[model samples]
Target chain A: PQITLWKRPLVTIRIGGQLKEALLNTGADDTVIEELNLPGCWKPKLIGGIGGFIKVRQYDQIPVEIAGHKAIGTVLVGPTPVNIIGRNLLTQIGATLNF
Target chain B: PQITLWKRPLVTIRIGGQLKEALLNTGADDTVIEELNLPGCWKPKLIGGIGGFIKVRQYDQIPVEIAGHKAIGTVLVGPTPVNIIGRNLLTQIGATLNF
Candidate 1:
């Protein structure tokens, strides 16, 4: 079997609306940024994590262009030591990334 | 020197006063268990993760005693997929665990 384990954490990310720095995620969703305090322009949408989803209507909206070509998806967010470009936007295009 | 990186994920655990089952972790702090909901007798405490801490009061009560021995330090928690004995207890008695 040639299954690839997409391990390794941390990534420099760019979010739409108001994120201006490289975010760090431990293991979060790609759509909502999980934090008690957010910015002014940040539009949060309530979503889910790995186990399941949530019931919040809006958490926050982050616009990341992603790398090259992919699909049309989004990601959820959470608090961790590193930033992750979650599955929401990740499912759109590539696979086995080394970035 | 024989340094340990503490790789691998997972093991069985037992809480102090609970007679339940296994738990999962996707990268969480020591205390607090992030969820849209919590279980009965569960409490929510404002705490912190890896980056910084929060101001909440309680999240939940997981009454865990670390194996081996280490130090005594409590931690905050949020949304993750695995269960952690955490440093609060793990480090309390100078313990070194693999789960």
Candidate 2:
């Protein structure tokens, strides 16, 4: 692989339910927090998309931890297990992969 | 505990058929993509939450920066699961829960 895999599996805190093994999608740009604490998120609203407009909140920064990395950015809270870890952080930290 | 279980079972890649797997989310406001590609997406007539009246490209802004943290340059073209990650991503970014 042209990318360098971290020595440890990326660790993240479960906002609601107990943490379980999750797929850290390197190709995605968002991270979903499954089973988060209720009344434990941002605002509410809606937005436009390919499927027309969908309900959504404005935008707010939340807490998350990955490896030794922690960010208080605007994260999404899905009621599912598809919590993602996008590739943006790699750019934010000027990350590089090694073979 | 039964709560921390990650079925990781029946890794779902199945789609509209027996070979596919499925997960019905009680909280999704939209849907998403697959591993290698996205299925066709359409602008469905919608209400409540978000949407609008405007003339735009069929696929011009297919790419997106959602809520703040969530984004998808293009919905996958195959096996993309249909659901919502709206209130999930948006509220987490723009609003706050001071309760």
Candidate 3:
């Protein structure tokens, strides 16, 4: 699938048996999701962005389906305005930026 | 050209006759350059992200070359951690996210 830049590259993703819409963020290093409860042990972590840094819970070895592609990696849960699928999971799903 | 997600998709861009590296950010709506002096009048604006909101100066109809592709659009100057080539400019250059 090819996503044009005319609109936000938002896609449907399945995580923890729940369906949610997430943005495909090429600038972000790690995948971050809005505050959600996942059945697993997580570690407290701090991540930074354009504004500043925020504390989040890092859950590892999580299986997520992005636009029908499956990827298992570390996912951070925090108070983000939107769910973001970052480069970590993007690489696993063989996503690329084309011009 | 195709850019894989294995590393940060940083590309050199020519703006105001100066060359600088910027990230192709699909998550961000507007292009933001870190603390640079752009010519012409600008408006004070606020933008938010995963962390919070920040104030910036928005310069309209500015010309920028991203990886040799030319685009003229609104550019924001601020105290961002990195220079970002957001969707506003990406659309002009016909950049896309592919899998």
Candidate 4:
């Protein structure tokens, strides 16, 4: 599927047995999601972005379903305004930017 | 051109008659560039992101060439870690996300 950039490229994703919408962010190196009751031990981490840095809990080898495409990788949980599907997961799903 | 997410989708952009590299950021709503001494009357603005908010100077109707594709839109100048060519400019160049 090709997603136009006229609007935020929000797509449905399934993680931790919960469905949520996330943005396909090519600029982000790591995937960050809002707080979810993920069942696992996570390590405290900090991620930097356009604004500044934020503390997050990093969970490794988490299985995520992005628009039906399965991917297992690291997921960062934090108090983000929105859920972001970054390059880490994007590559697994074979996502690309085209013009 | 199709850009795989294996790496950052950095592209050369010509803005204010200067060339710089920028990331194609679908998650960003507005285009943001590091300070480059752009000539124009801009307004002070604030933009929020993954971490928090940052103060910037908004320059509208700026001419920018993204990967050789011409686009005129709003450009924000601030102390960003990297130059980001967001959805605002991506749409002008007909950029899309595909999987």
Q: How many pairs collide in each candidate, listed in order?
A: 60, 25, 0, 0
In TM-score terms, candidate 1 sits at 0.32
Model 2, A23-62: lDDT tens digits are: 3433334444454554544776443323344443323555
Question: 1 or 2: which has the higher TM-score?
Answer: 2
- Order the numbered candidates by TM-score, best leading: 3, 4, 2, 1
Instruction: Report DockQ per prediction, comma-separated.
Output: 0.06, 0.06, 0.90, 0.90
Query: Where does candidate 3 stray beyond 4 Å?
Result: none
Q: True interface contacts reproduced by each model, as a fraction?
A: 0.08, 0.07, 0.91, 0.94
Report the interface RMSD that candidate 1 achieves against the true structure, in angstroms.
12.9
The RMSD (Cα, Å) of candidate 1 is: 11.3
lDDT digits (tens) for residues B1-99 of candidate 4: 988998899999999998999999999999999998788899999999876889999999999999889999999999889899999999999999999
Cα deviation at B94, candidate 1, in Å, is 16
Ranking by lDDT: 3, 4, 1, 2
DockQ-derived CAPRI band for the predicted complex in model 2: incorrect
All candidates: TM-score: 0.32, 0.34, 0.99, 0.98
Model 2: DockQ score: 0.06
The residue pairs that clash in candidate 4, if any, are none
- What's model 1's lDDT at B95? 31
Task: For model 3, state the Cα shift of residue B15 in Å.
Answer: 0.7
Q: What global local distance difference test value does model 4 have?
A: 0.94
Provide chain B TM-scores across all predictions: 0.38, 0.22, 0.98, 0.97
Question: Tens digit of lDDT per residue, candidate 3, span A1-99?
Answer: 999988899999999999999999999999999989998999999998788999999999999999999999999999998899999999999999998
Model 1 interface DockQ: 0.06
